[PDB]
């Protein structure tokens, strides 16, 4: 068996749970067959038995590093099926917290990558910044992560009176924090070695294996679903996709540090130009009525009672809506009968495709190389296992 | 608009510059300077028991059932808190109290089943079930985590003052 | 520069009443700092807030012995703080 | 701040000087206030031994012109 050796489920190196049954001739990897489902939990079947609004919390758990960006994909999908679109302020919010979430994911991906490599100080440096961001989530949603803030018809509640100012102070400084990590890793005489020319993926092969993420962008293919197919108001902002050449672990990394930088450019704008308005559609049909209204107006109570107890009652149809979640293209194919509860909801996980590529990326590579490549794919087993 | 993250003569000055970088580990020394710098920064940690990480009014935390100032428990067993709970956590069975009013004989939130979504906070018309601020309710035994009406009502009485302040701060938003 | 810290360090140490206060506070918290006393709740507890310190540590509570007769001097717990003063400690409300 | 890493170090330092001062005074006590002779080569051991025979049994005792 060429000394087949399970990478093992319990391994600090393996994010979450990954059995990589690997046959290694000494320290060289001949074949990697990743095993999955150590975190399958039924998210796709469970949703069929739940109403649209009570299936929103499942999406936050699908890939919870990127808590909200995932929620936006279901939102968009349910809004399309209803042909309803969120109010202008809600759109900007979703882009505001959409980006904050991208940073959160990249701080996770870059710093956790280093911890497996062996650099441990970048993680503590940026987890403090993460922490500060979580607090935004909490003061907007109530939960540090797993908010449930972005609902199918807009966000749930307007921003607290004062958040924008703090999402500024932080943004005004975060840059230096990214800069520091840099002085520690971008040019380390050693980061480069373990990362450069490891897991190079061709451009044609990346499209073929459905990579669709930084992994494509790192190989030089220019595709950001946020510029190619704008969703929400990511069209009204101006940002630069960080394309890469000589795609390899180091190049893609540089790309993830660059989108952390570009997201600060998008966040700034959102703070500078967020409109006065409502944060949820005015159709009591889709969005729950305000509590003052349901406690004084009969039509609002009836709409509150029916919405919470039964549901949206989406018109029959099916849609595949994909956003640019921090990992890559996150899409929900939501088939829907006229009923208030969905019929199918295949979650396309940027990650099911990326893991598959582990085999075609880590060939003739050492045990340490495999650890570096799992990092450069930002694998969150929640999205892959669903 | 796109950007090239890493897209790219040999002069003694240049080479000598590059060779010194490899020979005397110049960039490695650069990295050491950064960590020495923070060693001098104030640490961000908080004494956990003595100082607590800040949570604003919407923090969901631990379930509680409120009561009217008079002393009549708010819940009127409409049971849509049960309907919208995503995890099937809340179990409610009711019967008309002798007063003739409508009250819940049994209200059981299984906290291990609950995923603290906060929709129950949302759904209640009388707002009887609220997400209370406390997050520290870790328990030695699994049974303690299952909560009946008496624990939640008792939880409600203990934290009513802060729950009232929290709802006071956030109701305009809702 | 260093002169001031040496001086102000003495203030903190000599601030806790007698030798015992320091040795006590030192052992149960491991942090010595001086702040205005915002309030003392009926369950034995003392609360201090310092504007100068960063957001995480500007409000702290020094727990007291036997707040329900439990020998809590060593085994201090967070829940000991009363529900009324819990939100002040967690910065939920900036009003003591 | 960083003030606190010092306590621990102090107890390391103090525990790394003891040995050097200790070995270098348990020598100047056992050898009569004179550094223990280092006999790298035999000549030195000879001279040392010669000293032993010259007085008492211990080499550290050292007879002088008045003998």
């Amino acid at each position: 068996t060429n000394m087949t050796l399970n990478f093992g489920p319990q391994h600090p190196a393996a994010h979450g749970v990954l059995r990589l049954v690997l046959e290694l001739s000494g320290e060289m990897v001949r074949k990697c067959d990743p095993h999955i489902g150590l975190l399958h939990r039924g998210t796709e079947k469970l949703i069929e038995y739940k109403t649209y609004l009570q299936a929103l919390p499942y999406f936050d758990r699908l890939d919870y590093v990127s808590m909200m960006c995932n929620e936006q994909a279901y939102s968009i999908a349910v809004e399309k099926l209803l042909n309803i679109q969120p109010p202008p302020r809600a759109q900007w919010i979703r882009v505001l917290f959409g980006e904050i979430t991208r940073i959160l994911n990249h701080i996770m991906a870059v710093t956790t990558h280093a911890l497996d490599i062996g650099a441990m100080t970048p993680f503590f440096w940026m987890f403090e910044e993460r922490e500060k961001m979580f607090e935004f989530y909490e003061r907007v949603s109530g939960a540090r992560m797993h908010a449930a803030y972005i609902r199918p018809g807009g966000v749930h509640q307007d921003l607290p009176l004062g958040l924008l100012d703090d999402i500024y102070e932080f943004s005004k400084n975060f840059s230096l924090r990214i800069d520091e990590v840099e002085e520690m890793l971008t040019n380390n005489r050693i980061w480069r070695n373990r990362t450069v020319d490891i897991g190079v993926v061709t451009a044609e092969d990346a499209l073929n294996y459905g990579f669709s993420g930084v992994m494509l962008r790192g190989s030089g293919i220019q595709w950001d679903l946020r510029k190619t197919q704008p969703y929400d108001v990511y069209d009204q902002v101006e940002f630069d996709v960080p394309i890469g050449s000589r795609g390899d672990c180091y190049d893609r990394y540089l790309c993830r540090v660059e989108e952390m930088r570009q997201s600060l450019r998008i966040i700034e704008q959102c703070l500078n130009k967020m409109p006065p308005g409502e944060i949820k559609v005015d159709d009591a049909k889709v969005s729950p009525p305000k509590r003052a209204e349901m406690k004084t107006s009969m039509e609002s109570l009836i709409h509150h009672f029916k919405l919470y107890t039964e549901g949206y009652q989406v018109p029959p149809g099916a849609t595949y809506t994909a956003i640019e979640a921090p990992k890559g293209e996150f899409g929900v194919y939501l088939v829907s009968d006229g009923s208030s509860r969905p019929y199918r909801c295949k979650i396309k996980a940027p990650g099911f495709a990326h893991l598959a590529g582990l085999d075609k990326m880590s060939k003739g590579h050492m045990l340490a190389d495999v650890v570096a490549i799992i990092g450069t794919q930002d694998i969150v087993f929640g999205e892959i296992d669903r | 608009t796109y950007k090239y993250v890493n897209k790219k003569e040999v002069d003694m000055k240049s080479a000598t510059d590059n060779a010194a970088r490899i020979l005397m580990w110049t960039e490695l020394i650069r990295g050491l300077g950064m960590t020495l710098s923070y060693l001098f920064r104030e640490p961000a940690t908080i004494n956990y028991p003595f100082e607590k990480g800040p949570l604003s009014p919407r923090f969901r935390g631990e379930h509680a059932l409120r009561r009217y100032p008079s002393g009549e428990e708010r819940c009127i067993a409409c049971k849509l808190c049960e309907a919208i709970c995503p995890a099937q956590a809340i179990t409610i069975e009711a019967e008309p109290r002798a007063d003739g009013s409508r009250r819940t004989t049994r209200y059981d939130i299984d906290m291990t089943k609950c995923i603290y979504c906060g929709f129950c906070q949302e759904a209640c018309p009388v707002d009887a079930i609220v997400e209370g601020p406390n997050f520290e309710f870790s328990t030695e035994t699994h049974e303690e985590l299952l909560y009946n009406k008496e624990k939640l009502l008792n939880n409600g009485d203990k934290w009513e003052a802060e729950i009232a302040a929290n709802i006071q701060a956030d109701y305009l938003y809702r | 520069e260093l002169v001031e810290v040496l001086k102000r360090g003495v203030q903190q140490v000599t601030g806790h009443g007698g030798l015992r206060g320091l040795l006590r506070v030192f052992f149960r918290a491991n942090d010595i700092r001086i702040g205005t006393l915002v309030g003392e709740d009926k369950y034995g507890n003392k609360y201090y807030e310092d504007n100068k310190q960063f957001f995480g540590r500007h409000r702290w509570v020094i727990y007291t012995t036997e707040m329900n007769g439990k020998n809590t001097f060593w085994d201090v717990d967070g829940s000991m703080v009363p529900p009324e003063w819990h939100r002040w400690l967690h910065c939920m409300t900036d009003d003591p | 701040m960083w003030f606190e890493i010092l306590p621990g170090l102090a107890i390391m330092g103090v525990c790394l000087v003891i040995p050097g001062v200790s070995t270098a005074y348990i020598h100047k006590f056992t050898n009569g206030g004179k550094e223990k002779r280092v006999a790298r080569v035999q000549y030195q051991w000879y001279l040392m031994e010669r000293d032993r025979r010259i007085s008492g049994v211990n080499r550290y005792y050292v007879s002088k012109g008045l003998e």
Binding site: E169, S175 | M34, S37, F40, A44 | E1, V5, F54 | -
Partner: peptide
């Protein structure tokens, strides 16, 4: 809140001004 000397050791070792973008959030 750190002596300028110690603070300098920081700026020098870092190569940029952390004073402008501090780790301690304040009012």
């Amino acid at each position: 809140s750190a002596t300028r000397v110690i603070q300098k050791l920081r700026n020098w070792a870092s190569g940029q001004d952390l004073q402008a973008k501090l780790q301690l959030r304040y009012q």
